[PDB]
Amino acid sequence: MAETAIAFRCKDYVMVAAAGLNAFYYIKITDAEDKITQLDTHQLVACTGENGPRVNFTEYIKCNLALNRMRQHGRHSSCESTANFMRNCLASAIRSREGAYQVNCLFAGYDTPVSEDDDGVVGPQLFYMDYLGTLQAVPYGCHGYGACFVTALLDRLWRPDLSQQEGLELMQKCCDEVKRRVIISNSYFFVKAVTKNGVEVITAVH
Amino acid sequence: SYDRAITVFSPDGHLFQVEYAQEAVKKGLAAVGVLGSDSVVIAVEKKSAVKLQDSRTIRKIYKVDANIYLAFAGLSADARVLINKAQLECQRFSLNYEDTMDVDMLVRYVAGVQQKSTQSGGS
Amino acid sequence: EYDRGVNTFSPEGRIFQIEYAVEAIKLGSTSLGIRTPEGVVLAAEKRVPSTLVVPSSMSKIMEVDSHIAAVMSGMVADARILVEHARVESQNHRFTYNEPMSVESCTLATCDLSIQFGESGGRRKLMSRPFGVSLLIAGVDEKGPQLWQTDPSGTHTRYDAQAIGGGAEAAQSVFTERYHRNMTLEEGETLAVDILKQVMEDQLSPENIEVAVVRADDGKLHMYTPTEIKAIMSR
Amino acid sequence: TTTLAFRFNGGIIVAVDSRASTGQYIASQTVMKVLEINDYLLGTLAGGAADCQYWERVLGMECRLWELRNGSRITVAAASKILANITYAYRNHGLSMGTMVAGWDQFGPSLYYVDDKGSRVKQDLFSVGSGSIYAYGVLDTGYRKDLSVEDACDLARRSIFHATYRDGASGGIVTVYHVHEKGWTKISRDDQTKLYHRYFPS
Amino acid sequence: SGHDQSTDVFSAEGRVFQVEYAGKAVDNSSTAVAACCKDGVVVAVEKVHTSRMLEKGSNNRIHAVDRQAGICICGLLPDGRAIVSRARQEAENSRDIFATPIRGSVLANRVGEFMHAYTTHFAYRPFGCSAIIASYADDGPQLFVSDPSGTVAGYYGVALGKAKTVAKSELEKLDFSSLTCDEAVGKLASILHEVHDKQKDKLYEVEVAWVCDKSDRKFVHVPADMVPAE
Amino acid sequence: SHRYDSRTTTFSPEGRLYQVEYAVEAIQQAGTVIGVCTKDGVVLAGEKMVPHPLFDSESMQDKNTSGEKMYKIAEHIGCSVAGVTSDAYALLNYARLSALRHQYTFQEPMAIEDLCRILCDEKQLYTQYGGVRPYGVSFLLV
Amino acid sequence: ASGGSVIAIKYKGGVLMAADTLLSYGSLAKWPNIPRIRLLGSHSAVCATGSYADFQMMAKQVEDNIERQKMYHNVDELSPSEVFSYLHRSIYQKRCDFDPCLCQMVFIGVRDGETFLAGVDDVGTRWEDDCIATGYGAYIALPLLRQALEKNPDGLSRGEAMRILTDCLRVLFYRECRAINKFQVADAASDGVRISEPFDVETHWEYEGYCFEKTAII
Amino acid sequence: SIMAYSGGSVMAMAGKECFVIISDNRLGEQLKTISTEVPKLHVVNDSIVYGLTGLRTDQQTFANKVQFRTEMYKLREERDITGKAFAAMITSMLYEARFGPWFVEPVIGSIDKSTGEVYLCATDLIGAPCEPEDYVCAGTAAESLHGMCEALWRPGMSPEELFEIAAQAMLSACDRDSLSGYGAVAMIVTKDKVTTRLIKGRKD
Amino acid sequence: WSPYQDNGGTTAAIAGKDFVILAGDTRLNGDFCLHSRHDQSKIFQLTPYTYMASNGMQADRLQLQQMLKYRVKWYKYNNGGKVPSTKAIAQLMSTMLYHRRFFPYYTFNMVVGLDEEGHGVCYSYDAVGSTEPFLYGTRGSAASFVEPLLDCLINRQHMTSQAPPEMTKEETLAMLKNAFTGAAERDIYTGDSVSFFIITKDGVQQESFELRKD
Amino acid sequence: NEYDSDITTWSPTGRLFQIEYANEAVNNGSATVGVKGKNFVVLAALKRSPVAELSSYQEKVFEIDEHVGMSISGLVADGRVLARYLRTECMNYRYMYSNGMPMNQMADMIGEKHQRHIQCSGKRPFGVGLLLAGYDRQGPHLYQTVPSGDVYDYKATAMGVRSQASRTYLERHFEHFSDCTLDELVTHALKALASATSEGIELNVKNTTIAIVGKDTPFTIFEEESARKYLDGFKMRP
């Protein structure tokens, strides 16, 4: 909630960005900590929360996806399947003894035909995930204090057919707005993108 | 539950169940592994082309992990169970230590599982 | 055969499974152990199944701790369980008492694990059979160099010079002579090498056997390399 | 309690004070806040002293078991992962421990911070404890990667001293360790008041 | 064949042969006698010693179960000790859950039920001993016998062991209505001495216990200087 | 007692499991069913027992879930059985449960190979553990 | 049901332990004819301040242990020190299970000459001394008992101990709200422990400063 | 509270041989609208349509459980589940977690394809059923929905008239509710056909 | 009802060159009364060369003493009659104190004894077992009154004078007697008599020192 | 024989052959002798002699408590298990009552423990016999336990290989053991142990252990160094 995560999906890509803040009660431990975990070749999650639960949840999900790929002879899972698996994990956590994962997720991915018989999703996919186990497909989503600040901004400026460069400029505007309006210092924003070629780490926007 | 001693010693110091499992291995498809300067080659017998099998290819060499591959001789279903155990062990290792399991670590785990199969009651 | 149970007694009073597991030891490779005031020496015959085997992958001598080594004879697959248990117990002793664990205590823990076999499930899952392994644990502690021997019956015995495996009786016959209380470490090493020579069907080479030494003055375990074994032979 | 550790071209520098204050009263002035996990890994004491001591002893036992089973030394990434997993298992049990794992494995130097809630972060510079707010001010201002071993040790010693001078819960003897490829060496152990007289003569 | 290897198997004629073998083991044990004297119960057993260096009182076969109840063992002594432990558990359960001493008939029924449960399962074998329960509870003096088969029977006078028939015949000569414990102790000791063969059991001792009004209804051993010399 | 234990999950001097072979022999006497996998569908054709004149048809609605020889595991999965039919019903229920559990977890249809694998581990488990007889049934999955 | 204070003092030849025969239910003096001193074994006695149900259960558990051990095995009866050790361990085990025996017990015993006197709390604290007191006897009677002990360190005779014990009982009746003038004294000596019949002490209420006019608030 | 965290409202109304079930589109976090295109209706079969209201994660988990149960029922029992049996199954599922309750509140409408009888149900979070013959409604705008349905509903409505009444009631109830709105989605289920419609609403 | 109770009292240890001086005040008190003036349960002998001293709850330290004694006896059984060393007992005490971390003993303990070379060593612990070695140490109610005094006379800090020679048994005993005498005149929960244990290689000797009774 | 393969099988003559086989196992162990005096109990154990250079050590005599010890004969692992159980029970008793367990109660507990393993199908009898030497308020005690579960209270006894000679020797001097001093008791036990050795072996410190328990003497084991006082001067005079 202190750290703001942004994501928006366009015609040919999904761009996500995650603040790199890590703090101890008022002290900035570091400002460059990547909170975007790549799950599959064309899948990633931007997670907001404290380091422990976030890392444990992302590593659990990634390891389970890898194990499924091993036991299914390298068959990559669709974005909806992975999103539902994460949602089931989060929902099961909230009724367990160890408690709920205090992690808010923006899950981004690109679906490609696994074989010639495939007839599923082909475009990009974006999912908003609450820590309680909420899952919703959205054109754009945000978490953290600046989230609302970005959301209206996106409602003002987002278009379905934005190009990569114009999307980069839009993400730069969103990060600038978060830096401008949030008292919590989010100096660096760790932007990544998912396209048909996989995951790219974008350094221009930060 | 059923935990009768199945693998027991014989009056000549032999474990008959282990010898019979080895004999079952002796009737399996052949497999060879060769170690090179920068490559490891695994070849398996690939029983035959029945003309009735699926046109889609299926591998008889199994990917336990991104760096570790396995081939077997013997009973196919027991081999599949062992391979599933090895894959789960690799994932648990890479989840408890953040590092990928070495080949020797996984081999030791598999050998330990096979050993425990020879000393557990009812199995 | 399942005519008799695993807990049955022979009319002579011996447990059938334990006596059958003892005969499995004599079908294994030969292992040695020499205790001297300068230290304790472990020697073992590798007996690799082929020349393509990496000889280091069939280590007959395993390190329980920096001051305790163990050499096995019989079924090497079962010996791994015993050595892992000994390592865990030694690490627990170091954790709890902040001191190296004694050789006798390590052997006690190994035999405590070994004895837990049977068939009655009840509350605890027991082993369906005893271990087909005889262990030879060497070390250096506050009582100097100590050598102990472990049986499948779970009975530990402190020894001065013990040999297990196929060439056991011949090694003991050599032990009756040519051995005293105060041999030097080099003399013990040469004795072990000669005894391996006398009970080996194959020819002795630096890579054909495995030699380890725990020194009294150093207090640490030292695995010998093939060049060191050749240096021992060249004497 | 003030502890710091930073990574530079030449390895890792760890520095600690030696004060334990049970609230208002000074319990001891000789506490060892650097916990020598092995001859190649170092740990730090902060928070509940008993928790840190017990769990880093557990970590050292697991590292030794790893070495015995596998025949090779454990990596710092795996060693820090063991402590982080243990701590995360006990995140609802009220543990109080903030440690740093610093080591030189086959991939060069590496430093991790592990809190009492399972967090495990990997950066080039950390300060832990109630005096960290004073160390960072002296540490962030003079830190640079191309520091000499003597210069890095001086910077760490000066930062710990400046932490002990203003923080009432920090003090005692400033101790400085250096972790290099061959392991670690206890670089220095200097009294804090003598450090004041050395840094501010006359 | 295989019809006599476990207790969970009936024979073709409706018999459980393992229980009969346990009873045969009981029948090869040392002789014991007991008498209910309308004012108390007196039990007397013979202990055969295989060594002359045994301390006096070794291998006690009579054990107090409660204040007023005791059990004599005829057969395998360790099995009798297990049965005595079960009887002691039964007696203290009554004193703790129901705040009353256990009645002799109730204790005998509990002992019989405990002994019978080992004759119905394949994983256990029947006890190789018979239990003589002597009680002086609120239901008066009581003398019961529990068979390895688990059946219990009340007696005025009873004999068990190798020299059973002759001891029973000697017991048939008593009145049991005018008989008192003071003379019953001597009568039982004399019967045991007379019926015992002196050329096969060289070392023998007579162990006598009783619970009547003279001991405040407490099951104790006799004073040492009360049984006859021989 | 251990005397009457048949030792189903034990090896023989030839490394062969006699219970598995006897189950295979049992399946040999079951009705024949043939599967043909084409490019536009898969066909299952099986011989059912001669209809007695007093046989009655269960007046089930939705006459596409289970027949006398052929059953539906999921909307995208079907199967045919050969062998002990009563053993086949339990495994069919297990397969349906596994497919619906996979749909619960991932909200996608289970892969045919995955379902085939998951119910094969069930059959394998009874040949190594438990000390009971294995399932005497063969499945043709489509 | 709760019991009042218990006091005990060692004299030259044995131990004396006094307690009132009253169980109260809050401020209600519910039962004035309760024998609170219970005999354990053939050598010891116990009396508890506080909950009477917990004391009943603990005394039953302790007495069953002695008799069963003596009866089941041909062994000597437990010494008073051993009985008190078992009692203390049982009380502490109850405390560690968060089901404490909410009593403060005074324990006396004599065997073959050696005298034992001890006290134990509901939480596991145990101690031994020449004078023990629980409840308000710890604040009221105990200073007087200690003074009487220290005025003659060679040892108190039975009459001297009884006199100071009755004085302490009189003061307790004066100053303790939940008390009655009816007490029992158990005497542990070489032959065994003997509980006396209930008795009362003589009181004084005729001080000249106690009159109506001097105490009046006009 | 937890039931109003996600917002949302559902209402079912009974026609003659038909029923109209309508849900709002808003999904939010206690004030903030996460999405405006999240209907809460679920189709079990050609005869039963039910909606869930409450915590959104609980809505999704309970919907997955119900889908599992209905698919297993249709596999075991070679037939479509009926409305009354489906409502009873939901009641049992909700009462199993009586002390760990799910935070949903279902609204079930069903019709007999052969008879035409209409069955409505609306249980509590622990499964306490409620089967009237006019209408059921759950959600944050439950009071306003009840008022509008009480004021507008009549017994013998046609599918079109019933749909208009339901749409008007839903929109007017969402206007007075801050946690519901953004249009509506309606399903008219008759004996012969099923129609799905999306109804204009305020963007507030 | 609370499962904890503080019985007061204070202990103090000073480690010499070839000896250890352990000391504990013999006074057990309850809520507001005084249970005994001759309580000797504070100091417990584990081995002929190792002692433990506990402050706080009396029942908790009795239980801890029993656990330590039986662990030491098990160690002796499992090591061929070899008695555990002082450092081994210190580590065992730390481990067992931490094992009850969630229901801690209400004890503050010190383990004292001789090293392998014979030189005396002291160990101090918190409630949950945080061990720390030192040459002296005071625990209990009067620790804050006597620990700074031991700091001034032993470390000799802020003194522009040559350090006096290292103290013998007699001077250390006299210093500790002064410390307890000063503590008993200002702390209300300590002081009826002090038990001193002087631990050397030639056995251990015991001494009793009189204090005020108010 | 078709009635000896199981423990829960009664012989048609009323015998349990598995327990008899366990007794045979006990009869093949190293010889040991127990002697009880008026205040002391002395155990003598015959350990393996070295083969002219090779001294093997195996622990047969165990210390159970301050007042109790025992000597095993037969299966060493069973003896170790019984020693662990007895030590645990002694520690439990001394914790509850702050005193040592009485010897009669201890013997009853060992008997019950032995009986617990002779009636269940999934159990086997302990192939070891024990000689318990202790002291309590009732004076010296000397017990012998067998795999069947019987516990014998003995003035003096022996068990192991060729122990009939030791027993028949002790049957001539046992009635005087109530008057012999500690040294005389040790000499009697040593003579009994020497009566059980082979022809060409004489008792000496290298192959004999001496355990002593008394009224003011905690159970003390005597081996190579400490046994010089009792074995250096000792020879069997026929």
Ligand SMILES: Cc1ccc2nc(C(=O)NC3CCCC3)cc(Nc3ccccc3)c2c1
């Ligand atoms: C990386 C880091 C940076 C600053 C840290 N600062 C404090 C700390 O106590 N700061 C004081 C309070 C606010 C200002 C002064 C504590 C930390 N870790 C920690 C220590 C012990 C237990 C658990 C965690 C830190 C870790």
